[PDB]
Amino acid sequence: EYPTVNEIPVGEVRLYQIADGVWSHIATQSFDGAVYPSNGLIVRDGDELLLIDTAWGAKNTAALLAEIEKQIGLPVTRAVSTHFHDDRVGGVDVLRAAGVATYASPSTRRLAEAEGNEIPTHSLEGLSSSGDAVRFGPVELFYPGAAHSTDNLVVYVPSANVLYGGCAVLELSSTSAGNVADADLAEWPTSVERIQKHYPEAEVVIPGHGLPGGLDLLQHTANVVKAHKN
Numbered sequence: 001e002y003p004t005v006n007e008i009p010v011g012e013v014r015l016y017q018i019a020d021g022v023w024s025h026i027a028t029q030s031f032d033g034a035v036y037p038s039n040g041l042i043v044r045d046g047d048e049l050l051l052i053d054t055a056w057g058a059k060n061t062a063a064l065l066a067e068i069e070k071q072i073g074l075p076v077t078r079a080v081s082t083h084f085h086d087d088r089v090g091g092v093d094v095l096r097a098a099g100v101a102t103y104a105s106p107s108t109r110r111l112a113e114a115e116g117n118e119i120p121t122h123s124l125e126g127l128s129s130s131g132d133a134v135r136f137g138p139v140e141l142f143y144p145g146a147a148h149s150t151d152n153l154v155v156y157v158p159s160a161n162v163l164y165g166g167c168a169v170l171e172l173s174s175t176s177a178g179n180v181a182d183a184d185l186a187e188w189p190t191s192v193e194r195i196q197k198h199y200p201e202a203e204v205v206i207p208g209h210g211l212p213g214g215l216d217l218l219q220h221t222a223n224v225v226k227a228h229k230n
């Protein structure tokens, strides 16, 4: 029952419960003449919520906040953007104005700046090298190396064994790596291997777009990227 594009009009956000205190958020957005669904994550931390990624735009992200208040009723106090693209940081100004402390790596903040995207307020240090991992509230943040972009981070929720791959991970139905303008195709499969080695216990893997699955999303991603590179 995971929602797809045809079930979410642009401007609306759905939440989907993955585990106790862990949800994905699903939004839709038009980009270059096509509508795409996009995922982020919500993780409970006591009486507060940690948000992973915006809902791809200001209006979507305002809707996201409204849907969180309706469905969950706990305040979002911090947010992390997992790379510099607009499906990840677009809506950060809305979050900030709402009183949410927004975060990203220094590299993500610099690339967002260069690209004219919204820029999270606070820098996440300790994630500059492939294999680096840091605790951030109820999650672990991991930099696997360059993949979909050079700055992409993944997020693990230890209490639930849930791995959110963001766009470094592709859904099982995918036949291609999608938008690779900022990608490092030579490194990507290695980056995926690092994730596989570091989170062998992951039970649910959530891609940046499309359906969640099991650990096979990781190998599938490496295979697609390799096949794409050719």
Ligand SMILES: [Zn+2]
Pocket: 083, 085, 148, 149, 167
């Ligand atoms: Zn992207």
Ligand SMILES: [Zn+2]
Pocket: 085, 087, 167, 208, 209
């Ligand atoms: Zn994306």
